[PDB]
Design an enzyme around this catalytic site. Structure first.
Site, short mmCIF file in Angstrom:
data_model
loop_
_atom_site.label_atom_id
_atom_site.label_comp_id
_atom_site.label_asym_id
_atom_site.label_seq_id
_atom_site.Cartn_x
_atom_site.Cartn_y
_atom_site.Cartn_z
N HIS A 41 3.52 18.10 -65.71
CA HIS A 41 3.59 19.45 -66.28
C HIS A 41 2.21 20.09 -66.28
O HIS A 41 2.03 21.18 -66.82
CB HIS A 41 4.20 19.44 -67.68
N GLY A 146 -2.72 18.15 -76.53
CA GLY A 146 -3.88 17.84 -75.73
C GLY A 146 -4.02 16.35 -75.43
O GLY A 146 -4.94 15.93 -74.75
N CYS A 148 -1.70 14.31 -73.95
CA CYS A 148 -0.89 13.80 -72.85
C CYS A 148 -1.80 13.24 -71.76
O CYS A 148 -2.94 13.70 -71.58
CB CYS A 148 0.01 14.87 -72.27
ZN LIG Z 1 -0.05 18.12 -71.75
#
Ligand SMILES: [Zn+2]
Lengths: 306, 301
Positions: A41, A146, A148
């Site tokens: 993503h 923040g 990920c």
């Molecule tokens: Zn992310």
């Protein structure tokens, strides 16, 4: 002595954390040899994080629409010379091979297994903690927006085992992510919709390990001559949200060290689940199911008279 | 969201761990610049050491009575060219300066503070966990026989703050150690004696931070309009095994964000001390006191 949630030293993982930028978006990534892994993503902007389609977003991109930076230790640099999409991960090939790549493998943990998480923000490693894959294939972590691309791992006999890249928060304190084949644990999808998680159960064999840890540390009041056989234990478990018990060499090492039989422990679990009767086991008044038998053995590691 | 026991990444500290061997068998050491720190009970046997004299234990040995090796990463043997004694610590000098010395400072934590620990064996990093200096200045960790010299630290702004070198185990699950000025936390000593060990209490400001974390994670049943003044609470706290409360900015940040006042949390503490009565908070049935206001601020922001 003592028993605490213990993580594997993060040193070797720290040297592999990078930052990966695509447009307005920037996430954490993992740099191994000539490959950089990060959640897909990264290609999705503020707009369509709801319910996007990635297939179209991918062909839309080029080896240049990705920039990779290292912001710790030996700095970088790094040119994306190829890109691909593996499940919910994006796989980047880069020009330089990471000089600090540890011996490693990829695998997928099973429910009831624990691992270490290096939590990261803006490509900076920020915290280390241990989780385990719950019965419903989620983890109970601590992550914020923040985070990920954060990396879950174990370390055994020189080999770093990379098992998790963080993707999302499902509900309060409940998280999931994928292994490095890009399969999401729990099969959740990487879009911002309501997805329901299954029920979750106490992990019996971890509770048993825990009880053995208690005994080795001087707490043994829950141990009676009472026994429940495995087959009987297991019938009860199916109705009381416990996993089925299956024997293992690691549990049998603990039974042997303590002289307390497995089936005494299963009986203890039946009693204790009905109530601790106002007493405590290693400080807790509820059943702890997140130390595995291997976790317990490593902290109660001893010499065995043969 | 979520609240768990979190440690500072240990890589910069891993770079500094070494093995020290005397006469005989080894402890872990910390290699900073040209110095190597390690517990002083390493110039020591295994038979008797009950009432020793470290005075001479020091002068009896000399320079390469000490072997110092770096086992992980870049393997080296490190010549010892000088030695001396600070408190319960041994301060060696070595001909080679650690090229991977991080920016660092030394300090002493106060009871109620938390820090990360890198458990080590044979100069090898094994595990990382977080501990909290209890009211009686011990820690509840996880240490096995060869772990001495293991290192406690915190990190801020890229600076490693070294706060702890592991020395011994007192009871069971009860351990202690020294700061890098060679002073033992709790004023214990290099001795095989059942020293008294003070009475231990719940750390109030930490319980408050924990209740704030609970509210911020959707758990707020314990919050009432009921207030209790700080002064009234401290009185009650002495008769009830709790530490005195002293307001700080980190807490106010949490009071503000949740709109729940410190006096409400104090009142809630009195109610919950008596017992949780079937109900849980963040999966627990007892008042957790090892997360500090800073911890909670860090994890919830
Ligand atoms: Zn992310």
């Amino acid at each position: 002595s003592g028993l605490v949630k213990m993580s594997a030293p993060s040193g070797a993982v720290e040297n592999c954390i990078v930052q990966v930028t695509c447009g307005s978006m920037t996430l954490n990534g993992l740099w191994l040899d000539n490959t950089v892994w990060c959640p897909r993503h990264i290609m999705c902007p503020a707009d369509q994080l709801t319910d996007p389609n990635y297939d179209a977003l991918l062909i839309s991109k080029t080896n240049h629409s990705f920039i990779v930076q290292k912001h710790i230790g030996a700095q970088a640099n790094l040119r994306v010379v190829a890109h691909s999409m593996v499940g919910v991960l994006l796989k980047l090939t880069v020009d330089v091979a990471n000089p600090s790549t540890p011996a490693y493998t990829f695998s997928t943990v099973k429910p009831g297994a624990s691992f270490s998480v290096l939590a990261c923000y803006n490509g900076k490693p920020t915290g280390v903690f241990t989780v385990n894959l719950r019965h419903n294939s989620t983890i109970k972590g601590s992550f914020l927006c923040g985070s990920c691309g954060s990396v879950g791992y174990t370390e055994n006999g020189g080999v770093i085992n990379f098992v998790y890249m963080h993707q999302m928060e499902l509900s309060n304190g409940t998280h999931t992510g994928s292994s490095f084949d890009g399969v999401m644990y729990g099969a959740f999808e990487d879009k911002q919709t309501h997805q329901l998680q299954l029920t979750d159960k106490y992990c019996t064999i971890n509770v048993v390990a825990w009880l053995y840890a208690a005994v080795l540390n001087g707490c043994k009041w829950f141990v009676k001559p009472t026994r429940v056989g495995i087959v009987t234990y297991n019938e009860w478990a199916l109705s009381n949200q416990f996993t089925e018990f299956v024997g293992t060499q690691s549990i049998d090492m603990l039974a042997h060290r303590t002289g307390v039989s497995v089936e005494q422990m299963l009986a203890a679990i039946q009693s204790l689940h009905a109530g601790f009767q106002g007493k405590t086991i290693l400080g807790q008044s509820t059943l702890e199911d997140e130390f595995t038998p291997d976790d317990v053995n490593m902290q109660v590691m001893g010499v065995v008279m043969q």
